[PDB]
Amino acid sequence: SGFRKMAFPSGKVEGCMVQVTCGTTTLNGLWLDDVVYCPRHVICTSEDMLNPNYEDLLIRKSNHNFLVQAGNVQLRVIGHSMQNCVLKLKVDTANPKTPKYKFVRIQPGQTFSVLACYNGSPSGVYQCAMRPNFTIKGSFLNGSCGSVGFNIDYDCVSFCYMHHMELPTGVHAGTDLEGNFYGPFVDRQTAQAAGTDTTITVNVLAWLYAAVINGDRWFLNRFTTTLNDFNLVAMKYNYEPLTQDHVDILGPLSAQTGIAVLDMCASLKELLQNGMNGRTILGSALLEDEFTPFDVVRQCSGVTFQ
Amino acid sequence: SGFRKMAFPSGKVEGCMVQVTCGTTTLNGLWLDDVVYCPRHVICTSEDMLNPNYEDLLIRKSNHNFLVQAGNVQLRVIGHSMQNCVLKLKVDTANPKTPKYKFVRIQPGQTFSVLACYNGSPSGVYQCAMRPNFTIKGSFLNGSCGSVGFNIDYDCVSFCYMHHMELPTGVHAGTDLEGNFYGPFVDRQTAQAAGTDTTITVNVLAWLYAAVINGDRWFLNRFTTTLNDFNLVAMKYNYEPLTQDHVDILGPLSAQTGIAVLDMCASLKELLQNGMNGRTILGSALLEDEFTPFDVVRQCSGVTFQ
Ligand SMILES: *[C@](O)(C(N)=O)[C@H](C[C@@H]1CCNC1=O)NC(=O)[C@@H]1[C@@H]2[C@H](CN1C(=O)CCc1ccccc1)C2(C)C
Ligand SMILES: *[C@](O)(C(N)=O)[C@H](C[C@@H]1CCNC1=O)NC(=O)[C@@H]1[C@@H]2[C@H](CN1C(=O)CCc1ccccc1)C2(C)C
Ligand SMILES: [Ca+2]
Ligand SMILES: [Ca+2]
């Protein structure tokens, strides 16, 4: 028993990280078969930042202008192209550590692991959620751009995020591996407010089920609620609406614990209205929203990766 | 910026995990050069558990009784011995993925990453602390025994923990890689109370410095304190004494932030005496004690591993 904020094992992704330098800037790339993927602002300078002309900057770069290093072994670039906000650098050597992989675009409220990297070398791995406002609350310093976020299923790495920016509010923004931003953000220094963030209600419910599975049951009350009545309370506390799809996704945790989804919703309503009165749930004094239903089932069942 | 509970990249350790079966039980082993290390209770049955005679159980086992699988490739066992609470299985094949490594015995309040494994395959990675009572608050299910905890420094994996038990209180206990338990625990089902746990005061101070580095400064008050006066308050709230060694270890974070260690101690004294009044620090509504001073400096400086 026990419940931790668990990241995916990072080794399959570690074997794909490289360094990309184009004149000035060094950032991280992802090396899969004979392609290196990285943020297109590797081609920018200091003065370029309010509104870079990425097409003009790229027309002025040669294959040989890209210095790609895989553990300080140079990979020769033999082609380059821009796809939305990433570059794709074709190299003359396929990565022999390429895992089975997919590119996926995740939905707000889904979770993934980030392998934070600097100069092509890993610093650390942590789990987070894609906020409802399409930001992430990560740990990213200068040099981390091109770090990726991912999920694993059996032997297959699903890459979902590449890091590009830290907004003036100190939250993080990036793209999918086709280079399309999550959220209404652009890769330039210009005004670009994130939308108001909300709490991921289906994830809080999942975590309350995790608490019950792990014997932390004090918050269970004796009531039930309707879905519509729960949603009127959710709204007031800046929680996302709970949908029938969400109720259905919580069904297996409901069966494991014997606690109907709408009964758990009545317990969450009381926590929102009354607070926790100085108590903790799974070691937290706040309601946790960075575990999906699937994350709870995986961790509580010991699901492994090949 | 941002501050997360960051684990070490797990790939170097992933390449060392195997499965060990001796009749009944399957658990995890650690394969380094031509030796597999695992918990000695792989040799036990159901009836053996109140007080196993590990020497008698082992005299009755053959090399060939140990089925070692590295990704479901069998490794032939050509020798075995018991060292404290682990076995060492000599195999006829050295692990070609062996990293540079050391075995270390960590001190209470130090941190490490756990790679939670089942059937020799990784489930996930998370960071924790060795509690002052020599337990860990992990996430371990049946089948996780033999999972390890580790730190990385440049290219060198320091293995510090191997998982053996979950006490009746739901906390976790294990050994160093020489098989000596942390804490007054034994590998049998018998009464064995953990000592009262305390809060790791030097780690809370480190995390408050992390908060300042990341711009979360609301809790800084205008006062100072003596070390002795701080320790009288620490004592009351079941915090560990802060030593001069700890003050010296916090000196670099003190210099980075401009906040003297004893000034930070005065801010922590006010938080203990008055609470947080519904506020958070780095996203937490409690005072966090699972980051060491070195963990804070590493994360805030982007330290990487080769
Ligand atoms: C990334 O380029 C790198 N090399 O690591 C960097 C990461 C970023 C630094 C601080 N923490 C981080 O996550 N990203 C950037 O510096 C990006 C690039 C220009 C500016 N930028 C920002 O993060 C600032 C964004 C901003 C938005 C609105 C107003 C002002 C600034 C790019 C090309 C967006
Ligand atoms: C480990 O053997 C495994 N195969 O995974 C297992 C891990 C443990 C199961 C539940 N979560 C866990 O972390 N460890 C054990 O089952 C150990 C082995 C016998 C009993 N045991 C316990 O964890 C129970 C400890 C206990 C202490 C006091 C009183 C009653 C029980 C061994 C050999 C200690
Ligand atoms: Ca050349
Ligand atoms: Ca045989």
Residue B180 dihedral angles phi and psi, to the nearest 5°: -90, 125
> Which residues in chain A are immediately followed by a break of C to N over 2.5 Å?
none
Asked if B298's CB is within 8 angstroms of A1's CB, the reply is no
- Separation of CA A77 and ligand 3 centre (Å): 10
Give me the residue from B14, B119, B126 closest to A4, CB to CB.
B126
What lies within 8 Å, CB to CB, of B20 at 6+ separation is B26, B27, B28, B29, B36, B38, B42, B66, B67, B68, B87, B89, B120, B146
| Contact assessment for residue A171 and residue A117, using Cβ atoms and an 8 Å cutoff | no
Query: Of B62, B31, B57, which is closest to residue B42 (Cα–Cα)?
Result: B57
Nearest-angstrom CA–CA distance, A160 and A145: 15
HSE-up (13 A, CA, CB side) for residue B248: 3
Query: Distance between CA A54 and CA A58 in Å, rounded?
Result: 6
d(CA A28, ligand 3 centre) in Å: 20
- Asked whether the CA dihedral A234, A236, A240, A243 is positive or negative, the reply is positive
Distance in Å, CA B64 to ligand 4 centroid: 6
Using CB distances shorter than 6 Å, the residues near ligand 1 are: A 27, 41, 44, 49, 140-145, 164-168, 172, 187-190, 192
Contact B14 A9 (CB under 8 A): yes
The first and second tokens of residue A49, run together, are 């930042």
Q: Are A192 and A186 in contact (CB under 8 A)?
A: yes
Supply φ then ψ for residue A253, to 5 degrees. Answer: -70, -35
What is the DSSP secondary structure assignment for residue A233, as one 8-state letter? H
Burial A125-149 (b: 16+ CB within 10 A, else e): bbbbbbbbbbbbbbbbbebbbbbbb
Q: What sections of chain B are H helices per DSSP?
A: 11-14, 54-59, 201-213, 227-236, 244-249, 251-257, 261-274, 293-301
| B185 three-class SS | coil
Residues, chain B: 306
CATH of the domain at B227: 1.10.1840.10
Query: Pocket of ligand 2, candidates B17, B26, B189, B190: which has the most ligand atoms within 8 Å of its Cβ, to mutate?
Result: B189
CA-to-CA distance for B15 and B148, rounded, in angstroms? Answer: 13
Q: Would you list the DSSP string of B96-135?
A: TTPPEEEE--PPTT-EEEEEEEETTEEEEEEEEE--TTS-
Identity at B37, one-letter amino acid code: Y
Residue B225 is which amino acid?
Answer: T
* Structure determination technique employed: X-ray
Can you name the residues that pair with B83 across neighbouring β-strands? B86
Contact A35, A49 (CB under 8 A): no
Please state, in angstroms and as integers, the Cα–Cα distance from residue A286 to each residue in A40, A147, B47, B265, B281, following that order. Answer: 38, 29, 43, 25, 12
Q: Which helix H or strand E contains A49, and what residues bound it? A: none
* Residues near A19 by beta carbon (within 8 Å), at least 6 away in sequence: A26, A27, A28, A29, A67, A68, A69, A119, A120, A121
CB burial of residue B92 (10 Å; 0-12, 13-18, 19+): exposed
Q: Given an 8 Å threshold on Cβ–Cβ distance, is B118 in contact with A304? A: yes
Q: Which domain holds residue A212?
A: 201-301
Spatial separation of the C-alpha atoms in residues B120 and B285, rounded to whole Å: 37
Token code pair at residue B6: 């960051």
Instruction: Provide the token pair at A127.
Output: 């789990």
Give Cα separations from A304 to B75, B116, B117, B125 (angstroms). Answer: 21, 9, 7, 11
Query: What is residue A122's three-state secondary structure?
Result: strand
Give the separation between CA A185 and CA A171, rounded to whole angstroms.
Answer: 12
Q: In Å, how far is B68's CA from the nearest CA of chain A?
A: 17
Phi first, then psi, for residue B140 (nearest 5°) are -135, 125
Resolution of this model in Å is 1.4
DSSP-H helix ranges across A63-130? none
What does DSSP say about strands B111-118 and B148-153: parallel, antiparallel, or unpaired? antiparallel
